[PDB]
Write a protein that binds this ligand. Structure first.
Ligand SMILES: NCCCN(CCc1ccccc1)CC(=O)N(CCc1ccc(S(N)(=O)=O)cc1)Cc1ccc(F)cc1
Ligand SMILES: [Zn+2]
Length: 257
């Protein structure tokens, strides 16, 4: 039932998911002047060399690339995290126009899109159990700005025509997510939530300061996707982002001065 339209969008989600008005919801505005450098934070460890991508999928609210998480292949460690987090999937949020689309904002600035690499804490054994824990998931968030093309994204863009509508999937093997990462791993971190239902308060957010650049042609292909299933009125998959939520009793820490 939930979505991103006038009658089922983020302002309605609290009726089915009352945690939507909770104490650690995401996304948030990152006020760069109030985030405090935390010298105790460790460098992030992004170890993706052995990643095994499986499928690319239109799930009716985004498109996602799924990975084999049956083994410690692609893992996130370090930074604010205790333990090992396995990469499950990545997906994006994006806008109808280049001036909106990100979920997090930086000094109220919205980027054209935001990439989420979703990882779960292996001490909980499976992702369903991890979503029930305050430290169950770690999501690495990367902003997209429109400029030069990102070569490492093109293999994604070129297959989207084959998953236009909800439910459609395709083989998507041998995709290397390292090609989506910016140079710097400087980041902000705070405790938050899933940004789509069930909005569970289970996520350590790690948001990279450095955006990646993508071309207008690449993001325009995102905007050709469909929220609807095949044979239903065509509703473009655009503006599939939740707006910034109240920070409440939280501090955003920076890994960098
Ligand atoms: N209608 C949505 C169809 C499927 N959707 C949830 C289904 C649902 C809906 C309402 C109530 C219960 C369940 C996605 C899903 O299933 N995920 C991904 C969850 C997720 C990951 C990252 C972010 S993000 N944007 O990076 O913060 C947000 C959300 C795995 C999972 C596995 C086990 C769980 F118990 C829950 C989620
Ligand atoms: Zn997301």
């Amino acid at each position: 039932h939930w979505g991103y339209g006038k009658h089922n969008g983020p302002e309605h989600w609290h009726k089915d998911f009352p945690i939507a008005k909770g104490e650690r919801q995401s996304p948030v505005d990152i006020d760069t002047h109030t985030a405090k450098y935390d010298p105790s934070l460790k460098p992030l460890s992004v170890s993706y060399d052995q990643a095994t991508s499986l499928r690319i999928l239109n799930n009716g609210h985004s498109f996602q690339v799924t990975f084999d998480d049956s083994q410690d292949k692609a893992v996130l460690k370090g930074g604010p995290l205790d333990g090992t987090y396995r990469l499950l999937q990545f997906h994006f949020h994006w806008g109808s126009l280049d001036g909106q689309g990100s979920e997090h904002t930086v000094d109220k600035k919205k980027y054209a899109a935001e990439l989420h690499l979703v990882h779960w804490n292996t001490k909980y054994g499976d992702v369903g159990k991890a979503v029930q824990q305050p430290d169950g998931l770690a999501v690495l968030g990367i902003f997209l700005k429109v400029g030069s093309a990102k070569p490492g994204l093109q293999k994604v863009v070129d297959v989207l025509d084959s998953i236009k509508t909800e439910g459609k999937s395709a083989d998507f093997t041998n995709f290397d997510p390292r090609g989506l990462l910016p140079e710097s791993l400087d980041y902000w971190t705070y405790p938050g939530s899933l940004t789509t239902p069930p909005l569970a308060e289970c996520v350590t957010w790690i948001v990279l300061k450095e955006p990646i650049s993508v071309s207008s042609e690449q993001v325009l292909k995102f905007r050709k996707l469909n929220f609807n299933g095949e044979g239903e009125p065509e509703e473009l998959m655009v503006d599939n982002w939740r707006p910034a939520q109240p920070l409440k009793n939280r501090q955003i820490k920076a890994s960098f001065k």
